[PDB]
Amino acid sequence: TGKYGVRYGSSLRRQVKKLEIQQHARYDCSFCGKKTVKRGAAGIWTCSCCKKTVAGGAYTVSTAAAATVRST
Amino acid sequence: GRVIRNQRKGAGSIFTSHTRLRQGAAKLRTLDYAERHGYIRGIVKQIVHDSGRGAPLAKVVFRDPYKYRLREEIFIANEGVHTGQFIYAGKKASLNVGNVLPLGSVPEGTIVSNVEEKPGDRGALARASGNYVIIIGHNPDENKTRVRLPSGAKKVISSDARGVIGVIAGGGRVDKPLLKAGRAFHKYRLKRNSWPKTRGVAMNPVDHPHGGGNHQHIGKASTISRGAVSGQKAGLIAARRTG
RNA sequence: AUUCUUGGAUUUAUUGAAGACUAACUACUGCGAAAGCAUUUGCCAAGGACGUUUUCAUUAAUCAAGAACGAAAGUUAGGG
RNA sequence: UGAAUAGGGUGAAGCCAGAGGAAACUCUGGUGGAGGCUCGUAGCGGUUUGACGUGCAAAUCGAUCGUCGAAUUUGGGUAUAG
RNA sequence: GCAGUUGGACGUGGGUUAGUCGAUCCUAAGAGAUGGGGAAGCUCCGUUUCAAAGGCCUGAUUUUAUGCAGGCCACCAUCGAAGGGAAUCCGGUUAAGAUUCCGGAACCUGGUGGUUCUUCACGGUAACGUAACUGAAUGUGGAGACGUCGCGAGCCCUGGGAGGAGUUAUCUUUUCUUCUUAACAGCUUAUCACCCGAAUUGGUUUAUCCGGAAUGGGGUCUUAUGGCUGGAAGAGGCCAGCACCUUUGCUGGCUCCGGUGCGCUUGACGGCCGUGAAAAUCCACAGGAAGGAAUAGUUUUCAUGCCAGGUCGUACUGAUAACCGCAGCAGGUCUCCAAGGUGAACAGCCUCUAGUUGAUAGAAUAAUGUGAUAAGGGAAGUCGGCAAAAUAGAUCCGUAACUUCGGGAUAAGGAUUGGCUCUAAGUUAGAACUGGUACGGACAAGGGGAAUCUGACUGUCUAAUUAAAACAUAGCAUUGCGAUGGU
RNA sequence: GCGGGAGUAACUAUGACUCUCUUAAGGUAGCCAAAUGCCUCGUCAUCUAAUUAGUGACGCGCAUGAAUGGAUUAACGAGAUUCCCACUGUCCCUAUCUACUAUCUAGCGAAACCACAGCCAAGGGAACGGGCUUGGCAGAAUCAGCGGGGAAAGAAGACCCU
RNA sequence: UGGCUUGUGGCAGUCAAGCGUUCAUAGCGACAUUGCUUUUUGAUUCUUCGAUGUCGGCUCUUCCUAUCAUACCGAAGCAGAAUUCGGUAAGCGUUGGAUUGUUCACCCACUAAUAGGGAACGUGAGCUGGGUUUAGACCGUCGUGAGACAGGUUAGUUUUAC
Numbered sequence A: 001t002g003k004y005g006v007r008y009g010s011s012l013r014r015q016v017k018k019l020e021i022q023q024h025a026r027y028d029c030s031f032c033g034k035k036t037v038k039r040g041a042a043g044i045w046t047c048s049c050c051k052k053t054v055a056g057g058a059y060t061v062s063t064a065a066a067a068t069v070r071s072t
Numbered sequence B: 001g002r003v004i005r006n007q008r009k010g011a012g013s014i015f016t017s018h019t020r021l022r023q024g025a026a027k028l029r030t031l032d033y034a035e036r037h038g039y040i041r042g043i044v045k046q047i048v049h050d051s052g053r054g055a056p057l058a059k060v061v062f063r064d065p066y067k068y069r070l071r072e073e074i075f076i077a078n079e080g081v082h083t084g085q086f087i088y089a090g091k092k093a094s095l096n097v098g099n100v101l102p103l104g105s106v107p108e109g110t111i112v113s114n115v116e117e118k119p120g121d122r123g124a125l126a127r128a129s130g131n132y133v134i135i136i137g138h139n140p141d142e143n144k145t146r147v148r149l150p151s152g153a154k155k156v157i158s159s160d161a162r163g164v165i166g167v168i169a170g171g172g173r174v175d176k177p178l179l180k181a182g183r184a185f186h187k188y189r190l191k192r193n194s195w196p197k198t199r200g201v202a203m204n205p206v207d208h209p210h211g212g213g214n215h216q217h218i219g220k221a222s223t224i225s226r227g228a229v230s231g232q233k234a235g236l237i238a239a240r241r242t243g
Numbered sequence C: 001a002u003u004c005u006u007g008g009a010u011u012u013a014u015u016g017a018a019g020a021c022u023a024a025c026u027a028c029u030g031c032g033a034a035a036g037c038a039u040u041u042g043c044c045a046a047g048g049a050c051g052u053u054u055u056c057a058u059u060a061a062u063c064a065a066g067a068a069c070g071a072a073a074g075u076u077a078g079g080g
Numbered sequence D: 001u002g003a004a005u006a007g008g009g010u011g012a013a014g015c016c017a018g019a020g021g022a023a024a025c026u027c028u029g030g031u032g033g034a035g036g037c038u039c040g041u042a043g044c045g046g047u048u049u050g051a052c053g054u055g056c057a058a059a060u061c062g063a064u065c066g067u068c069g070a071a072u073u074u075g076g077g078u079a080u081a082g
Numbered sequence E: 001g002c003a004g005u006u007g008g009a010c011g012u013g014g015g016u017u018a019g020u021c022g023a024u025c026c027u028a029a030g031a032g033a034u035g036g037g038g039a040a041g042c043u044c045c046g047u048u049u050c051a052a053a054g055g056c057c058u059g060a061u062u063u064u065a066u067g068c069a070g071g072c073c074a075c076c077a078u079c080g081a082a083g084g085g086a087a088u089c090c091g092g093u094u095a096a097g098a099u100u101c102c103g104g105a106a107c108c109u110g111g112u113g114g115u116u117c118u119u120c121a122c123g124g125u126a127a128c129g130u131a132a133c134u135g136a137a138u139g140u141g142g143a144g145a146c147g148u149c150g151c152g153a154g155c156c157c158u159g160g161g162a163g164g165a166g167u168u169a170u171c172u173u174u175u176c177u178u179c180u181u182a183a184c185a186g187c188u189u190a191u192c193a194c195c196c197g198a199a200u201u202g203g204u205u206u207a208u209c210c211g212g213a214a215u216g217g218g219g220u221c222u223u224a225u226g227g228c229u230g231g232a233a234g235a236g237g238c239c240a241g242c243a244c245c246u247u248u249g250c251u252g253g254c255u256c257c258g259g260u261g262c263g264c265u266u267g268a269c270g271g272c273c274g275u276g277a278a279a280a281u282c283c284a285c286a287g288g289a290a291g292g293a294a295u296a297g298u299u300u301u302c303a304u305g306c307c308a309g310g311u312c313g314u315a316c317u318g319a320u321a322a323c324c325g326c327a328g329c330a331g332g333u334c335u336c337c338a339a340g341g342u343g344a345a346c347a348g349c350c351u352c353u354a355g356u357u358g359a360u361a362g363a364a365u366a367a368u369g370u371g372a373u374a375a376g377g378g379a380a381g382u383c384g385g386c387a388a389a390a391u392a393g394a395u396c397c398g399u400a401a402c403u404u405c406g407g408g409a410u411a412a413g414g415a416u417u418g419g420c421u422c423u424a425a426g427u428u429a430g431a432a433c434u435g436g437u438a439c440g441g442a443c444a445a446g447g448g449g450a451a452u453c454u455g456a457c458u459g460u461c462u463a464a465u466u467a468a469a470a471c472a473u474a475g476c477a478u479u480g481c482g483a484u485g486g487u
Numbered sequence F: 001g002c003g004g005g006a007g008u009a010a011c012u013a014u015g016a017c018u019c020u021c022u023u024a025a026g027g028u029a030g031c032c033a034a035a036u037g038c039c040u041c042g043u044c045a046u047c048u049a050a051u052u053a054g055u056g057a058c059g060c061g062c063a064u065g066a067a068u069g070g071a072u073u074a075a076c077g078a079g080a081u082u083c084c085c086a087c088u089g090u091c092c093c094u095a096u097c098u099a100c101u102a103u104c105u106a107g108c109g110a111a112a113c114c115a116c117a118g119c120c121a122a123g124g125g126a127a128c129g130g131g132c133u134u135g136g137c138a139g140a141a142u143c144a145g146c147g148g149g150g151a152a153a154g155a156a157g158a159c160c161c162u
Numbered sequence G: 001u002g003g004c005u006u007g008u009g010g011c012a013g014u015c016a017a018g019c020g021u022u023c024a025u026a027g028c029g030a031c032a033u034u035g036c037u038u039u040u041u042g043a044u045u046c047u048u049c050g051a052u053g054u055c056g057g058c059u060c061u062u063c064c065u066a067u068c069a070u071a072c073c074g075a076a077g078c079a080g081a082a083u084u085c086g087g088u089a090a091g092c093g094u095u096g097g098a099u100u101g102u103u104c105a106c107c108c109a110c111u112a113a114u115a116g117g118g119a120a121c122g123u124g125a126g127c128u129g130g131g132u133u134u135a136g137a138c139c140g141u142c143g144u145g146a147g148a149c150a151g152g153u154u155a156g157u158u159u160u161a162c
Helices: A019-022 A064-070
Strands: B100-102 B111-113 B131-137 B143-150 B162-165
Touching: A064 B111, A064 B143
Parallel strands: none
Antiparallel strands: B100 B162, B111 B131, B111 B162
8 A cells, every 4th residue: 555556546555554453563472472473474473572483374463364273 | 580488498598596495395295094092193392484486484393303404394384374273184083173184084174285186296286375175075075086276177096195274374365466567577477477468469470370451350260179280279178258 | 838757856765965945833913113023042132011119309391403223125345 | 695875845644632523624833754755965867059071989079958865876796699 | 271499290208116006706697628428510418426625444665743544424516797705095206106116104914922612531610721633504594685665753054253454445453364173992872672561651742553651481682874982102284483694494382163065874663566586605503600790711812923925917098189970070978076156956157276379361341141139010922831930937817618527727818026114023824115118127928719530648750862650559359379389 | 251133002202121143151249431432522410701610410321330349437648639818020011220250351361172175046956065067256454243044062763664 | 545526615706686765786685596616514335455554733844825014006975084895915923821621612801903725734763642443341222142332431652873
């Protein structure tokens, strides 16, 4: 959206910041919590604090994969 | 006519690039048959991008000397591989997302990434980002198994394959589109192929047989069959249904 | 008649998979301010009515603007 | 794979405060971050006009005109030959 | 391209002294050497197990030493940087130059003197002392290791004191100018984290945070702009005094202090994604004693003596007479350093350190081709507003359709400056006064109103007559197509 | 890939609708005199000292038509027309002054480069004569100028055919 | 291109019956032709490929009158004057703008008023390069097609010293 600029028209350029926002801010970790946990690497949501691994599948903390096998 | 652009594929200058710079794109190494509590199984180390894939990967340690110096073991990136959780393997393994293990051990309708499909290949299907296949060929499919690969088509498999359970890491190529074309050209240097393209009708019938006419149109034909030569075979290769 | 069948259909049984809906119970029934709400079980969570009372003491009624909610059909992006 | 852009103007998103509003709108200031945001030099491009063509370069010279954190420019090494 | 006392032309010889500055290992682009085969050669393949390298045990020979052969050990395997991989300052002197010769002071590479823990023996013991024999870190796990981007808080002109001179011309000793200095070691600061943990609250602050201040278990620590201290007993320097053969040669001597950048400090922190490399050497290889205080050593560090440093490039030009346009041609040509005041910077303006006008010349200065000015007119002229004119800053007022709501605005329509005094004995803005052609006075610095098209946007382009509507573009769909694909 | 011939409504004037032939069978939403129109100064309004542009429509479509797509519709340009305001050496209208050279001189020293010859009017003619026929005319030493011929500086023409 | 003829044709003499109030000739002229001529408009390969480069205009270098206007004259079916017609005679004068590439086509404002014909239309080593011989790209129209067209559109070499 910042990087995007004038490229695209109404449906795309305006609306992608509304996808970026929920991918942004620094959240709690699954096992600690200072301000660290965002999109660290691409799809890999990291932790700079106590360094701790998450397990979901693709996006954030849980996708379709962990909703099946780490559930049943 | 001259040499067509599709013939310049086997060799070429545009068909060279960095090969050994690539640290190890995502196959799978030796990882223990057993799981008699496990031998060759350990934690994830680093998160590093190999060129070719266009997605993050990882390094892994097992029982063997793997942090830096020994250059091989690269581990398939699932959300969110990092230091301080274990991987497990073996035949009759524990079914979790982020564990590499057989297709036989998982039930029907499990999503899997970095999966083999021929008799051994280390890792074939769905190595980069977004991708995954769907194993649905057990139970009334009795002996020979079958991954139903994501379009619609076939593939007979014997015993065959291991692979990580899940959907893979990333998701920001279809999920998030790009912006411009020089930033798209970063694909066509980690892959060797000509880029971009000019129209077939705009090119002369000399350089590509889709040209012809003062008022430009398609000279020969757009639909050409499967059994054909080099310059002869272009366009839509066997247009089975039009529309 | 198009159509489907001797390249074995309809079908009968067995086995496996995918989605949607919940017959009967079902009513001259109940709930929700209206739109609306049908297998069974569990969790968070709301409202009405009754009963001896206890209790703050007009705190109330109504309300243009304004704010929030919206059957179906239609539109956008990703799935099925 | 190595080297290079001084100077100068704005600022969503995130987050807080203050007046105001049944509540929301509204509305006043601070904190702060993403730019083909944007601007002028390096690097770098070629619209107009006059003089040359037995002359300085085998397409030359003067006046005049463009871009610059982006699809950026450039050196070196190395490979591809009808 | 002339003269010519001149030249790289012409001819002859000399000068360039390194462990010290370059000439290496391993990772990338990328590539090489060797043998046999697969096969028609090319070539791919093998190197990955031996190889290569290292530890432990045994036998024969010889010596101041030594060196060799056999037996035993699985835990690793291709090649090449600019980014990764030794050391250094200052003066004398030269026809020329030294981190090179040389003078003075360093450092790297080998030959002489001093011991700390696991674990163990003997003696002694709160103790500590010593003889026998002591190679030594292919890792759990962490590092060397790489997209874009933002706010801090510190880092100057000038003065003070000392020496010297009052200007060809009216006149001038608190006027101007010169002088005003110095490797290293010791001393000892911002960031981080066992202040994780967290009661509390230093830090413009939103603050969970981290600190004055308080708590554990018994409690504290690293890195480091600057400053302070040592070296320097000594050395230089504004400027003068003598010898005196009057050619030429020496000898003596001053001041020393206060207001400030874009270096470095900050990958943390803030916050986004396209998701951040690989490796040899090397770090990594797990702390005990006294509460801490305090005190010592280390397969490490201190003390001390002698020799040797390989092997060449080394002159010098490097916008050039050495490179390079056949050329003594209006040329190509990597790339280093950064003062004053005026104007943002690196425009312009103009002086320093500092340098220089080329292989022909004089006098007049037609026609014609090369520069500016002006009455009146105001587009009337020419393929052709091409050419040429209006206007311009700072600060305040005032201002148009309609939106893919990211927009248009500097639309139009108007008004004023510098200087000096005063507001306040110290940003800047408000009051007040006069004049001229005019306050931006060199330099420098927007034309506006009204109607209309196409490619969405930025982007690619015909090398000696075609810069576009050609083609790309983020994005979207059908078809090949399960990859041992399609091609 | 997406038709012809014939007949037909008060009244000038037109064909809704109907019949017939032919072929595999004959087009919607929306728009028009085009980068495409023979016919056409078509036909009408406004503008202009005339004005066909500006801008207003007419219907008289040689030959418009939905996916290598109609259609909604904002921002941006060394790209394309006109009206309107101030105005302009482009011109009217040319003059004057200035820089440098021409004139003139020294030195050394180019360039591709070699037809006997060099008047005009009339006449014949290898066909447009200074050159051949008659007639009129034509002297030399020398320098500065200027674009008319011969047709320069040059390449075996650009049209054109093998 | 030049030559030739005057095809295609222009002009005049003019046969002069008609018709204009009577009335062959104020005027109008059936029907056409003879001589001249080279203008509408072309017949012909005679003479030409080691160049035969285009149009409208600017600028400057001629001659004739198939005559617009100025000197001189005569006549009418002409009242002065308006109107209508013919002879002697080439020294001179012969506009400004708008439509249109453009003279043609076509209109206006004046003014005393705004002619005819040839000459290498002076005419690209004086000048513009709009008109005018190749090369981006598109449409209509035609052919199995690469592509083409007696149809239109968009960009696309004026060198130098006589």
